[PDB]
Amino acid sequence: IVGGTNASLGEWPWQVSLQVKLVSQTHLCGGSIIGRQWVLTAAHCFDGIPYPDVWRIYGGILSLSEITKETPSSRIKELIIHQEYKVSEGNYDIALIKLQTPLNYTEFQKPISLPSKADTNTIYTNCWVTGWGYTKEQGETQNILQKATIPLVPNEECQKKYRDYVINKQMICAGYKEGGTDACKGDSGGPLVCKHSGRWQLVGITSWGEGCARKDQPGVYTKVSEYMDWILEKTQ
Amino acid sequence: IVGGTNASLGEWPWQVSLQVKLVSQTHLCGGSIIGRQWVLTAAHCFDGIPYPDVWRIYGGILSLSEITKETPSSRIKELIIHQEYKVSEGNYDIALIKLQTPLNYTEFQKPISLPSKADTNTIYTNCWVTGWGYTKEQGETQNILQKATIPLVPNEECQKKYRDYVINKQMICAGYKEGGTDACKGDSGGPLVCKHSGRWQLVGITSWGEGCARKDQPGVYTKVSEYMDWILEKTQ
Amino acid sequence: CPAYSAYLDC
Numbered sequence: 001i002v003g004g005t006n007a008s009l010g011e012w013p014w015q016v017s018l019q020v021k022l023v024s025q026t027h028l029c030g031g032s033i034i035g036r037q038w039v040l041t042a043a044h045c046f047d048g049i050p051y052p053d054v055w056r057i058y059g060g061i062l063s064l065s066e067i068t069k070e071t072p073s074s075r076i077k078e079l080i081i082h083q084e085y086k087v088s089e090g091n092y093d094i095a096l097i098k099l100q101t102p103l104n105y106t107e108f109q110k111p112i113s114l115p116s117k118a119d120t121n122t123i124y125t126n127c128w129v130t131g132w133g134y135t136k137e138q139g140e141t142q143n144i145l146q147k148a149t150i151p152l153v154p155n156e157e158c159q160k161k162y163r164d165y166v167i168n169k170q171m172i173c174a175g176y177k178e179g180g181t182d183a184c185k186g187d188s189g190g191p192l193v194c195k196h197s198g199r200w201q202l203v204g205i206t207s208w209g210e211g212c213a214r215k216d217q218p219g220v221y222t223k224v225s226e227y228m229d230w231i232l233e234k235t236q
Numbered sequence: 237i238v239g240g241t242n243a244s245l246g247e248w249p250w251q252v253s254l255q256v257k258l259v260s261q262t263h264l265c266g267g268s269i270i271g272r273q274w275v276l277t278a279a280h281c282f283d284g285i286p287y288p289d290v291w292r293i294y295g296g297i298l299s300l301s302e303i304t305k306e307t308p309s310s311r312i313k314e315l316i317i318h319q320e321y322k323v324s325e326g327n328y329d330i331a332l333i334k335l336q337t338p339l340n341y342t343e344f345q346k347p348i349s350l351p352s353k354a355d356t357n358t359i360y361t362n363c364w365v366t367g368w369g370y371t372k373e374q375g376e377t378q379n380i381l382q383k384a385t386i387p388l389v390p391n392e393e394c395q396k397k398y399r400d401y402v403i404n405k406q407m408i409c410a411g412y413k414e415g416g417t418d419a420c421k422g423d424s425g426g427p428l429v430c431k432h433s434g435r436w437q438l439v440g441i442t443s444w445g446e447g448c449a450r451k452d453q454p455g456v457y458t459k460v461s462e463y464m465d466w467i468l469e470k471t472q
Numbered sequence: 473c474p475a476y477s478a479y480l481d482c
């Protein structure tokens with residue numbers, strides 16, 4: 001994250017590191033526990049490596065440094081990427097992951113609530129980004145989970161700050177007019193969460209942005225409320 | 237290479253390193269540029285990691301040190317392993333990598349001539365093996381490309397040493413009985429080039445033999461002259 | 473890796 005600080009154990013108990021094991025293992029993507037067997041991330045995280053054997057998912061951890069090979073992994077029973085997702089595009093950037101084994105919930109490992117379809121036009125005032133991405137452009141993966149509060153930029157004002165690219169209603173933008181607060185490389189698939197009724201809700205999934213925290217270049221996030229029928233369909 | 241010495245920038249411009257990139261990068265194999273879009277290498281270089289969008293190919297570099305994010309790298313569009321190759325056995329050990337974008341030849345990066353089908357049984361005499369492999373058993377990957385010359389040993393002299401392994405007309409052997417000069421780990425898929433009529437031509441591809449220059453343990457190489465049919469058939 | 477890619481490799 002650009003322009004944030006260490007999180008604590010149990011602040012963000014839904015956040016997971018997705019890792020790839022080839023010759024060596026490494027963090028690539030964030031995601032969110034939404035149920036015992038279910039993790040929600042971005043489609044672009046599996047662009048290059050769509051083989052689920054290869055992937056490891058880790059929860060209740062504050063630093064990647066605390067993950068070895070003797071650490072229990074959740075593994076992909078099933079990888080559901082929205083059919084409409086095209087491998088080199090920003091649309092339909094969302095994937096569901098069924099785990100082989102249901103997770104045991106703890107102080108440190110909890111699911112986040114999803115919004116109603118009814119929450120589509122709701123205005124959130126208190127929104128946070130988390131992950132182990134870069135703190136700067138030309139940065140490097142962090143050991144300690146980062147967090148940052150970010151204001152939602154309404155969709156029309158976000159469109160006009162990206163003339164080249166096309167902002168959907170199924171996208172949601174966050175950032176300051178200048179600002180150093182934003183998601184970066186390695187924050188892919190991580191949650192934008194907002195507090196609405198005193199509880200946390202996954203409002204967005206880190207998707208794409210032009211640079212990290214550049215002046216007037218807000219981050220763009222898959223808007224989860226808009227995929228709630230897709231989520232019920234693929235989870236039953 | 238074992239028994240080798242520092243090659244020199246331009247000495248072997250067909251030589252490429254084959255590397256697995258996630259965030260990190262690891263030199264795993266060598267190959268030979270035979271075409272703007274074509275690299276020839278060993279099938280067993282992709283047994284452990286058969287996923288293509290994880291591989292990177294670097295040509296016209298002398299050291300792996302040279303490489304950072306700056307350094308441009310070809311990517312696999314198609315990976316064509318020999319249909320009769322079997323991980324159990326070391327026969328038909330040959331693979332063609334089709335590069336995404338065509339290569340732009342220089343002093344440092346040029347193809348190499350394939351042998352002709354009729355060249356089978358020709359005895360070549362000015363034979364070189366190149367690669368970044370180990371310089372000793374249980375050694376480590378080399379920063380700077382290593383060249384070494386080596387005599388061929390004909391089949392039936394070779395097949396004597398490989399009591400349980402079948403050495404056939406589709407293979408060449410090369411090494412010194414008491415010589416201790418050979419191809420070690422990381423040289424697999426790398427070229428065995430023997431200068432003949434007047435130019436260097438790829439005669440064999442580094443294949444197998446657990447051991448590096450054990451006395452009386454000559455390197456086995458896929459005999460490129462016996463897959464000319466296959467190679468041209470696969471370059472429609 | 474385009475300009476918009478938030479993805480780690482690049």
Ligand SMILES: *[C@H]1O[C@H](CO)[C@@H](O)[C@H](O)[C@@H]1O
Binds near residue numbers: 308337338339340
């Ligand atoms: C060398 O030349 C082409 C020309 O576009 C490049 O685009 C490509 O990088 C290739 O390797």
Ligand SMILES: N=C(N)N1CCCCC1
Binds near residue numbers: 182218
């Ligand atoms: N939020 C920003 N800036 N992003 C989202 C993650 C991909 C890189 C750009």
